[PDB]
Amino acid sequence: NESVIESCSNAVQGAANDELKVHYRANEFPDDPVTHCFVRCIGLELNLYDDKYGVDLQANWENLGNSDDADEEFVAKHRACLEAKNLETIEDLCERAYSAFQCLREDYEMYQNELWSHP
């Protein structure tokens, strides 16, 4: 939603940027340090992500237009994708969040046309 986007653009140094905000409202998130932190900010604010507990897969399932329990294969595939990113070894919190987000990026794109992954 606009609110969280506006707030995160202010919370993140450099993110209050016309050209980047154009991408963000268009659901594109370039692989750059400002966007990394912006993506982290949105994940934290929407309760989709946590620096320690990783991705909440049920919350993302629901953010993808579902109101039911996540499909088992959705959970399994993303848990595996996320484990493969070795997030706990990424020291920079924004880079870690962006890397975790990359596991869900396609789901969000297909949609656009708690199940913490690290309990």
Q: For binding to ligand NH4 (CB under 6 A), which residues are involved?
A: 6, 9-10, 12, 16, 37, 40-41, 44, 47, 56, 59, 67-69, 71-72, 82-83, 85-88, 94, 114
Show the binding pattern over residues 25-64: x = contacts ligand O=Cc1ccccc1 (CB under 6 A), - = does not: --------------xx--x----xx-----x----x----
Tokens of 26: 């268009």
Contact 88, 73 (CB under 8 A): no
54 forms bridges with which residues in the sheet?
50
Q: Which does 55 bind (CB under 5 to 8 A by kind): ligand NH4, ligand O=Cc1ccccc1, none?
A: ligand O=Cc1ccccc1
Min dist. Cβ of residue 68 to ligand NH4 (A): 5
Q: What angle do CA 11, 60, 94 make, to 5 degrees?
A: 35
- Check the CA dihedral 60-66-71-74 and report its sign: negative
